[PDB]
Design a protein around this ligand. Structure first.
Ligand SMILES: FC(F)(F)c1ccc(OC2CCNCC2)nc1
Length: 126
């Protein structure tokens, strides 16, 4: 069901969180080789998450579930903000700009934190 597909998507999201918090430790420790690998892993987790979220939204639309569609439109919009910040973080790492990397890191944590009450609302609406 769309609800079990949302539980898979949620698990993928939490994996990226787990990996994101590990990457943050490695960055603070200056282990740049680890950071590079974690950033590649996060790219693959987000790209997967985003595809799943689109399939949930499209299914909610086909089912006529107007409340779930509303919430998923808002949630996917916030997802694209996090993805843009993530991409900027990756660029800062390539460029050797630790000041920007720290800044983006904190921004992505706040964007992710804000979007959590909505994430729980979607689970209940599907
Ligand atoms: F890269 C993401 F996976 F999106 C990512 C980035 C940050 C993040 O932060 C967690 C950890 C504390 N801030 C809010 C939730 N959770 C996920």
């Amino acid at each position: 069901s769309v609800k079990s597909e949302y539980a898979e998507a949620a698990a993928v999201g939490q994996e990226a969180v787990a990996v994101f918090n590990t990457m943050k430790a490695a960055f603070q420790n200056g282990d740049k080789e680890a950071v590079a690998q974690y950033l590649a892993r996060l790219a693959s987790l987000y790209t997967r998450h985003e595809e799943l979220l689109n399939r949930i939204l499209e299914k909610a639309r086909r089912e006529g579930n107007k409340e779930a569609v509303t919430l998923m439109n808002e949630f996917t919009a916030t997802f694209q903000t996090g993805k843009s910040i993530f991409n900027a973080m990756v660029a800062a790492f390539k460029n050797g700009d630790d000041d920007s990397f720290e800044s983006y890191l904190q921004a992505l944590e706040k964007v992710t934190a804000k979007g959590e009450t909505l994430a729980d609302q979607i689970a209940k609406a599907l």
